[PDB]
Design a protein around this ligand. Sequence first.
Ligand SMILES: *[C@@H]1O[C@H](CO)[C@@H](O[C@@H]2O[C@H](CO)[C@@H](O[C@@H]3O[C@H](CO)[C@@H](O)[C@H](O)[C@@H]3O)[C@H](O)[C@H]2NC(C)=O)[C@H](O)[C@H]1NC(C)=O
Ligand SMILES: *[C@@H]1O[C@H](CO)[C@@H](O[C@@H]2O[C@H](CO)[C@@H](O[C@@H]3O[C@H](CO)[C@@H](O)[C@H](O)[C@@H]3O)[C@H](O)[C@H]2NC(C)=O)[C@H](O)[C@H]1NC(C)=O
Ligand SMILES: *[C@@H]1O[C@H](CO)[C@@H](O[C@@H]2O[C@H](CO)[C@@H](O[C@@H]3O[C@H](CO)[C@@H](O)[C@H](O)[C@@H]3O)[C@H](O)[C@H]2NC(C)=O)[C@H](O)[C@H]1NC(C)=O
Ligand SMILES: *[C@@H]1O[C@H](CO)[C@@H](O[C@@H]2O[C@H](CO)[C@@H](O[C@@H]3O[C@H](CO)[C@@H](O)[C@H](O)[C@@H]3O)[C@H](O)[C@H]2NC(C)=O)[C@H](O)[C@H]1NC(C)=O
Ligand SMILES: CCC[C@@H](CCO)Nc1nc(N)nc2c3ccccc3n(Cc3cc(CN[C@H]4CCOC4)ccc3OC)c12
Ligand SMILES: CCC[C@@H](CCO)Nc1nc(N)nc2c3ccccc3n(Cc3cc(CN[C@H]4CCOC4)ccc3OC)c12
Ligand SMILES: *[C@@H]1O[C@H](CO)[C@@H](O)[C@H](O)[C@H]1NC(C)=O
Ligand SMILES: *[C@@H]1O[C@H](CO)[C@@H](O)[C@H](O)[C@H]1NC(C)=O
Ligand SMILES: *[C@@H]1O[C@H](CO)[C@@H](O)[C@H](O)[C@H]1NC(C)=O
Ligand SMILES: *[C@@H]1O[C@H](CO)[C@@H](O)[C@H](O)[C@H]1NC(C)=O
Ligand SMILES: *[C@@H]1O[C@H](CO)[C@@H](O)[C@H](O)[C@H]1NC(C)=O
Ligand SMILES: *[C@@H]1O[C@H](CO)[C@@H](O)[C@H](O)[C@H]1NC(C)=O
Ligand SMILES: *[C@@H]1O[C@H](CO)[C@@H](O)[C@H](O)[C@H]1NC(C)=O
Ligand SMILES: *[C@@H]1O[C@H](CO)[C@@H](O)[C@H](O)[C@H]1NC(C)=O
Ligand SMILES: *[C@@H]1O[C@H](CO)[C@@H](O)[C@H](O)[C@H]1NC(C)=O
Ligand SMILES: *[C@@H]1O[C@H](CO)[C@@H](O)[C@H](O)[C@H]1NC(C)=O
Ligand SMILES: *[C@@H]1O[C@H](CO)[C@@H](O)[C@H](O)[C@H]1NC(C)=O
Ligand SMILES: *[C@@H]1O[C@H](CO)[C@@H](O)[C@H](O)[C@H]1NC(C)=O
Ligand SMILES: *[C@@H]1O[C@H](CO)[C@@H](O)[C@H](O)[C@H]1NC(C)=O
Ligand SMILES: *[C@@H]1O[C@H](CO)[C@@H](O)[C@H](O)[C@H]1NC(C)=O
Ligand SMILES: *[C@@H]1O[C@H](CO)[C@@H](O)[C@H](O)[C@H]1NC(C)=O
Ligand SMILES: *[C@@H]1O[C@H](CO)[C@@H](O)[C@H](O)[C@H]1NC(C)=O
Ligand code: NI
Ligand code: NI
Lengths: 747, 747
Amino acid sequence: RSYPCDEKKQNDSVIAECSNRRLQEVPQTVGKYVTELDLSDNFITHITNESFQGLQNLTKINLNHNPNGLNITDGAFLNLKNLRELLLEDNQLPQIPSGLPESLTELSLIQNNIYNITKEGISRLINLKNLYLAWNCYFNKVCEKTNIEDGVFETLTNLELLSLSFNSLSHVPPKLPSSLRKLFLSNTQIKYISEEDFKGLINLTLLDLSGNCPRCFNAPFPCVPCDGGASINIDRFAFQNLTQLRYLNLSSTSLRKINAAWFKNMPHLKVLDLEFNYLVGEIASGAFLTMLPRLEILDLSFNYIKGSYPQHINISRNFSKLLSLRALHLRGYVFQELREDDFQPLMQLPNLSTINLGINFIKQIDFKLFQNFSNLEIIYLSENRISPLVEFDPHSNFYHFTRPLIKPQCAAYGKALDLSLNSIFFIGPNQFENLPDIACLNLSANSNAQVLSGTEFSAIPHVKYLDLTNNRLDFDNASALTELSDLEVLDLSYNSHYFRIAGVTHHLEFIQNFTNLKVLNLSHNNIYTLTDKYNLESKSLVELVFSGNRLDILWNDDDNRYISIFKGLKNLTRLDLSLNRLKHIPNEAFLNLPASLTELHINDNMLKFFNWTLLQQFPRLELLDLRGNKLLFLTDSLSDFTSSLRTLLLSHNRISHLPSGFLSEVSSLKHLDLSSNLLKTINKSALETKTTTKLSMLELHGNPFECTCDIGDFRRWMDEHLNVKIPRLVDVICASPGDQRGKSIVS
Amino acid sequence: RSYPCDEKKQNDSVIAECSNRRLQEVPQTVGKYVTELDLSDNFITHITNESFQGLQNLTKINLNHNPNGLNITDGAFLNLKNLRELLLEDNQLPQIPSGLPESLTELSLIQNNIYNITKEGISRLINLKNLYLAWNCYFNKVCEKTNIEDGVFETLTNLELLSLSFNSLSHVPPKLPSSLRKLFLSNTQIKYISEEDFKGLINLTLLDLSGNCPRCFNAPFPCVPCDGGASINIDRFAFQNLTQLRYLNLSSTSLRKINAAWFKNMPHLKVLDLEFNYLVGEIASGAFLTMLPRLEILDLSFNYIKGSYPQHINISRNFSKLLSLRALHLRGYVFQELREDDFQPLMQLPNLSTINLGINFIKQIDFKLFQNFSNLEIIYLSENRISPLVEFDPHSNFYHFTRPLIKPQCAAYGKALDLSLNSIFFIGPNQFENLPDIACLNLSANSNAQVLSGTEFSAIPHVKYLDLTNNRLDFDNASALTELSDLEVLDLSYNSHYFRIAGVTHHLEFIQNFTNLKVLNLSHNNIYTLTDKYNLESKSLVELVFSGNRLDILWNDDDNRYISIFKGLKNLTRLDLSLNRLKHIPNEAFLNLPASLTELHINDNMLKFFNWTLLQQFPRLELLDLRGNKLLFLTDSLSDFTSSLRTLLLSHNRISHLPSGFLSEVSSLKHLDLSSNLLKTINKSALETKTTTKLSMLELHGNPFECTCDIGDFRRWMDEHLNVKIPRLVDVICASPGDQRGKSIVS
Ligand SMILES: *[C@@H]1O[C@H](CO)[C@@H](O[C@@H]2O[C@H](CO)[C@@H](O[C@@H]3O[C@H](CO)[C@@H](O)[C@H](O)[C@@H]3O)[C@H](O)[C@H]2NC(C)=O)[C@H](O)[C@H]1NC(C)=O
Ligand SMILES: *[C@@H]1O[C@H](CO)[C@@H](O[C@@H]2O[C@H](CO)[C@@H](O[C@@H]3O[C@H](CO)[C@@H](O)[C@H](O)[C@@H]3O)[C@H](O)[C@H]2NC(C)=O)[C@H](O)[C@H]1NC(C)=O
Ligand SMILES: *[C@@H]1O[C@H](CO)[C@@H](O[C@@H]2O[C@H](CO)[C@@H](O[C@@H]3O[C@H](CO)[C@@H](O)[C@H](O)[C@@H]3O)[C@H](O)[C@H]2NC(C)=O)[C@H](O)[C@H]1NC(C)=O
Ligand SMILES: *[C@@H]1O[C@H](CO)[C@@H](O[C@@H]2O[C@H](CO)[C@@H](O[C@@H]3O[C@H](CO)[C@@H](O)[C@H](O)[C@@H]3O)[C@H](O)[C@H]2NC(C)=O)[C@H](O)[C@H]1NC(C)=O
Ligand SMILES: CCC[C@@H](CCO)Nc1nc(N)nc2c3ccccc3n(Cc3cc(CN[C@H]4CCOC4)ccc3OC)c12
Ligand SMILES: CCC[C@@H](CCO)Nc1nc(N)nc2c3ccccc3n(Cc3cc(CN[C@H]4CCOC4)ccc3OC)c12
Ligand SMILES: *[C@@H]1O[C@H](CO)[C@@H](O)[C@H](O)[C@H]1NC(C)=O
Ligand SMILES: *[C@@H]1O[C@H](CO)[C@@H](O)[C@H](O)[C@H]1NC(C)=O
Ligand SMILES: *[C@@H]1O[C@H](CO)[C@@H](O)[C@H](O)[C@H]1NC(C)=O
Ligand SMILES: *[C@@H]1O[C@H](CO)[C@@H](O)[C@H](O)[C@H]1NC(C)=O
Ligand SMILES: *[C@@H]1O[C@H](CO)[C@@H](O)[C@H](O)[C@H]1NC(C)=O
Ligand SMILES: *[C@@H]1O[C@H](CO)[C@@H](O)[C@H](O)[C@H]1NC(C)=O
Ligand SMILES: *[C@@H]1O[C@H](CO)[C@@H](O)[C@H](O)[C@H]1NC(C)=O
Ligand SMILES: *[C@@H]1O[C@H](CO)[C@@H](O)[C@H](O)[C@H]1NC(C)=O
Ligand SMILES: *[C@@H]1O[C@H](CO)[C@@H](O)[C@H](O)[C@H]1NC(C)=O
Ligand SMILES: *[C@@H]1O[C@H](CO)[C@@H](O)[C@H](O)[C@H]1NC(C)=O
Ligand SMILES: *[C@@H]1O[C@H](CO)[C@@H](O)[C@H](O)[C@H]1NC(C)=O
Ligand SMILES: *[C@@H]1O[C@H](CO)[C@@H](O)[C@H](O)[C@H]1NC(C)=O
Ligand SMILES: *[C@@H]1O[C@H](CO)[C@@H](O)[C@H](O)[C@H]1NC(C)=O
Ligand SMILES: *[C@@H]1O[C@H](CO)[C@@H](O)[C@H](O)[C@H]1NC(C)=O
Ligand SMILES: *[C@@H]1O[C@H](CO)[C@@H](O)[C@H](O)[C@H]1NC(C)=O
Ligand SMILES: *[C@@H]1O[C@H](CO)[C@@H](O)[C@H](O)[C@H]1NC(C)=O
Ligand code: NI
Ligand code: NI
């Protein structure tokens, strides 16, 4: 079996996953058919022409974050004739390594100490397509200004992407190759853009000039503005040859005025980022908006005027000219109320599907305005002040998060409205009156402490996914949420406020009324007592998440009231009982779990005992997760209790003995995780079979193995059953005797 | 050194703390001078007349929770002639042990399976003062009705306390000894109290008859009411001879009427518990209130009428007759508003110091009414609906928590007002207008998201302790809270809402304005970015809790802005930097910590390195807590860097080597905790000294010790330095070789 890497086929490639393994040097045991070697996050200090000798099939090597700087000799990689991608990020490299192979098409030197880009380093790398040199000198790091040798990129006639962001450049480098498609120059101290800087870049599709003359008020990083907080100075004809431009990033360039003619020669500009500028005036007038008919994304976030909290947002009539617009981001403009008249220019846009108004301190909204859009799909109003109606990831965006605004699982149902992190503490009878038909509603974190009673959502009765997490909801009415006839997903996580009070009444009977409820999450509610109806019932429910409650109290051996709590969930296939402080489950309570279960999690409890015999009543159980408990032993007759179990997770328990014949006849078991237990040895008889079984993954890392001659049988078993993958062999370590301690058992 | 117990002198006694040590049997190595032996929470299965042989000095033995049932032979303890207290709780005992010693004065058999109280078991125990037999048959436990042999307690002529609560008794046992002072009969299924039941109990000071004919609606336990939910039936003259009664517990007896004459012969009744009854009518009229002039505590909590949410609380004019009343508990009465007129009967009471109105769903209050009380000290209004002004511990109380209503540290300053767990989401200019002078104010968990600006608390400017935890406060004004000139303790824990948003402004400059601020808690605020002023400053602050923030971000090596964040806290002696995800502290940032520090906690971070040399700039540092980090090694020159360090906590780190001379010259160090590290051995040279040093406590449990001949020097060091206590010797275990694994190193 391969050691120390884990090999995986990925289409026309074989990846040797060898990261985060405490490797002091590159292993001389890499498979000859391995094409991509990931050695990131190890303690490798030196690379020589011997490091990867003979490994001619390598097309990619990742040495990022080594040593967790990296010493690379001249020509160390030269003999690898098929090497195309070399990642050397976060290696404290003082220079571009010398004698790199001419076959390289991608070279990443992000987050190093390289302040000189020389012809000796890269002129010979004529096949380079992508070159990343970002984040070598920035913020208050002690570093030198970047010297770019004149014409250093000129011979790179196939270069398509060049990134020099987060380096002190002062000027755009001259003599850039005309093959460039993407040029990143963010946070480079380039205060002036001349008409010659991008002269020959006729195939450019992306230009990033963000963070040059930055807007520094309240910056979450060391920020140095241009003299007098002045804007980036762009010559009138700087972009005249950028006819193929699709992406233009001018975020944090302290822009107050936008010359509409800068877009005259950009007939296909698609995404324009103007976040962190001073464009409230331009948003209200904006002649440049008339020069962007094929723009799809416009980001004008955080353009607020410090000290100004106006009553309304002032959107120019010229926003109506953005006929291709699909997403408009207007976070941090800052205004008190959003009225129908204020968004009239956006209502004629036929494909505007996302509107992001997060972080504007909005207090009130005429919700009826959202009925007058053609294809509005995401209405993102999270993090405002709406009340009841009367360190830096170099591979991500620096000015905004890139995750979906609304969870794709919620947004997939239809029109999505996100009102999370607001103050809609009480939903009165007219709160949702003039809203369009909403399918996905997020009301998380609104300080809502009301008793929902079946009428609050009557104006939007087709909500399919409702997120009410992180409120103080008082479940005190059996008719709660029943007006949502089509509800499929309901998230009530983190509403423990009233559940934790014994003396108040608690009612969860409403769950039974839903004909189409599939997923219900009651996590972290501290549920320990219910009033009158002790059971959850539903003919439709498929998944119930009950983690972070108190089944230790509900199933106390002196109380029989909750022994059938989940029995009525007749269609349930997934059940999560993690984090319920369970020391034991009464046998009658385990037997009352739905017989339809396919996946049962009881991880992260304090289980001292598990009655394996009871698996005879779960003929469809495929996954049993008992990780993070205090189980002391395993049954020797699992094969007699189940013919369906496929995955059994027992990591982080106190099992010190694997019984003889444990797996001999459990044919269905594919994955067994016994990692982080107290196994000192494994006898041959515990893993051997006399029949063909489906075991293909066995985890044993973190056990305190005794590496005397008594471990030989387990080692011989590993050699004789190569189809059973054992991951993390570097962590399947000897705890004793002293001479073997720390060494991997495979040696 | 004593093994396996830890011995401690406690006045005229020596306690062998031997609990929770995995002991399979009572050790035969108990010290001959030990007078109290605590063997609770072990795996002891058998007790014989050999178990404690020779240990004649034992006056107390605690065997509670063994085995974690206990098999006790007839006469096993008989030879212990000085044995006075024997605790045998939670031992699954089927009977009272036979042949117990006549010297017993206290016997506890709580939480066992004893359903027969016989003369064979206790008639000979004539010196018994306290006998606890509670919790043997209750709720849905499979158990038999308790048979009390006629006259079983009659020979116990010195019995002062008898507890039989949580057993099925049906009737009060006849022939109780007249020496009784406290009789507990709670939850005993005693539906009728006859005039003969307490006839001779003329010295009784406490009578507990709670839970007999219980009020079962919404009970957090299996509850069986009397037929037709009827009340406990008490004969008119049942309490005629209880002239010394001080405590009477009638909670959950389904009382609707209280006969005032039941108190005619109780001239000194002090505490009366009537919680969980149906006494709204009696609270409004209450003739019984005229018969309690020396009552100090009255608890009428949870007497609400199911389905009734009245506008006002109806307190009888007869509450004015409770002239000795000190505390009135009226939780769970349930009413919408508290007006001045409603509490007029309480205002004439001269020593009413506590009023508890928790859990009443109160929406509004005329706060001016609290100005008209003589000595109101605690105004407890937690867990209501106040909006902006327009399993069972057998040793605790079953019907209410016994902890202080308000933290003693807050209440000690003066008049305390607790408004936590309400909905005062915004403090307007008239919110505290008519409140009396408040010294301790709790506004925790009110969903408050306002920008405090220095005027909100102007009507109560002498608040000394202010708790604003668990809100959504927006620290966006430098003048916040500055009107509280005398503020000494400020708790801002759990107000992370706005701190976590980079794009909004954050202002903590207000801290500097307080002349008398001593303690500030900014825990769990996710603080990672501040606006304009990056430093905390204060001439008075003594303690700062900064746990649960992001010093990993504030002290990122590429940012110099926060390197002096705590330097201006010139009087600081205690600093908590735990839970800040720190991997390293920049040397300049550690050197900028206040030189006045005496106690520094940096526990539960991920520190890989600690620069020990920098302790030279902290001449008053006495405690350094680095527990729960990933430190790989220790300095060999700690003695050169400090002459003040007294306690050094390094548990839960990755130290595998103790350097030679580590402690030889650090004379001041008293306590060193190296538990749960990766020490395989300890060389003699690492702990030896050539000078007299103050080391007196060394923790080493949880290390993977190699028990070959190389551990002999450490064992000889332990034998030669007995003044250095090493706790938990049962957990100072051999990890290797196989033959020694699991055994204690002391053998
Ligand atoms: C409704 O709105 C809330 C609040 O805006 C959304 O909550 C956010 O959900 C994301 C994704 O689950 C959370 O991110 C996670 O953060 C943890 C660390 O805290 C990390 O371990 C995960 O990998 C992940 O990145 C985010 O923290 C959370 N925000 C808050 C304030 O809770 C929620 O997703 C929205 N619901 C729907 C249906 O869109
Ligand atoms: C409350 O419980 C629900 C149900 O478990 C949680 O939603 C579920 O979250 C999981 C984990 O993020 C989602 O699974 C993941 O889906 C993605 C996309 O398909 C996939 O790439 C991952 O491998 C994984 O399978 C799951 O789809 C999602 N279910 C639904 C219906 O949304 C929810 O996050 C819980 N809420 C809180 C606050 O924890
Ligand atoms: C202001 O009011 C709040 C809310 O009523 C008080 O908070 C409560 O404080 C107690 C004592 O610290 C907390 O108890 C602790 O619980 C944890 C487990 O959660 C346990 O580990 C501790 O040993 C302790 O028992 C209690 O949970 C907490 N309640 C809430 C809802 O946070 C606060 O003490 C009041 N402040 C003053 C100055 O009195
Ligand atoms: C925010 O930080 C403050 C300051 O550390 C916390 O208050 C302090 O809590 C500790 C631990 O409970 C108190 O110490 C204990 O005091 C008792 C009584 O004297 C003593 O028996 C214990 O041995 C221990 O010393 C300390 O007095 C208290 N300080 C003050 C001024 O109240 C507070 O609990 C923290 N808040 C949260 C929400 O964690
Ligand atoms: C994304 C914007 C972040 C900041 C910017 C402040 O310049 N705003 C805010 N930052 C925080 N942390 N909170 C709030 C806030 C809370 C409620 C309502 C509006 C709010 N704003 C908006 C704002 C307010 C003001 C009046 N505030 C005074 C009154 C109290 O003392 C100060 C002036 C300009 C404003 O935006 C430009 C902010
Ligand atoms: C300590 C009392 C615990 C329970 C007892 C209920 O019998 N009350 C409450 N339990 C919870 N979990 N919440 C609330 C609550 C929230 C806001 C205001 C009052 C509230 N009460 C008070 C109450 C209300 C009603 C009207 N509720 C209907 C309207 C909505 O559907 C039901 C009748 C009798 C009442 O007390 C007797 C309760
Ligand atoms: C490269 O892989 C091929 C096919 O997987 C194999 O035949 C060849 O020997 C390998 N070459 C080297 C140098 O390992
Ligand atoms: C590596 O380079 C050295 C000279 O520095 C040479 O002697 C050796 O043969 C080279 N090894 C390989 C595998 O090319
Ligand atoms: C890298 O290692 C070589 C020896 O293998 C040494 O000569 C050279 O100076 C090292 N480079 C650095 C930066 O230490
Ligand atoms: C894009 O333009 C440059 C010259 O202007 C050229 O080198 C490159 O190959 C062009 N793209 C294609 C696909 O030829
Ligand atoms: C609705 O949108 C149209 C453009 O499609 C606009 O002309 C009209 O005035 C809008 N009406 C309202 C009521 O907002
Ligand atoms: C639930 O609330 C509705 C609407 O307020 C009310 O009509 C109904 O009586 C409530 N149900 C119960 C059982 O209180
Ligand atoms: C059970 O769940 C499936 C989806 O997994 C659903 O199609 C089916 O209708 C459910 N059964 C009932 C009775 O609702
Ligand atoms: C498992 O459950 C059965 C049936 O409830 C019970 O008879 C048996 O004793 C349990 N097994 C163990 C090991 O306790
Ligand atoms: C009891 O303790 C005393 C004084 O501590 C000691 O002299 C005596 O020997 C002890 N007796 C026994 C039986 O251990
Ligand atoms: C304990 O009792 C046995 C009889 O069961 C007796 O032989 C033995 O001597 C007794 N031991 C002590 C120490 O009293
Ligand atoms: C206790 O142990 C003795 C033997 O030492 C045995 O005779 C007796 O039956 C045991 N009691 C129980 C309840 O098992
Ligand atoms: C209390 O009363 C009983 C008899 O009525 C008696 O046994 C007991 O000793 C009395 N208290 C005192 C201090 O004598
Ligand atoms: C204040 O209390 C007194 C009794 O001390 C009472 O007579 C008087 O009416 C009360 N006044 C007000 C305004 O509540
Ligand atoms: C702080 O708030 C007060 C009261 O609203 C206001 O007068 C003052 O200008 C604010 N300070 C700042 C710096 O905004
Ligand atoms: C420093 O703290 C002490 C209390 O520990 C206090 O008495 C003293 O006044 C404080 N110093 C200043 C300058 O406020
Ligand atoms: C400790 O700090 C000093 C002064 O800042 C620095 O010179 C030294 O290198 C640091 N020690 C270590 C081991 O890095
Ligand atoms: Ni085999
Ligand atoms: Ni010595």
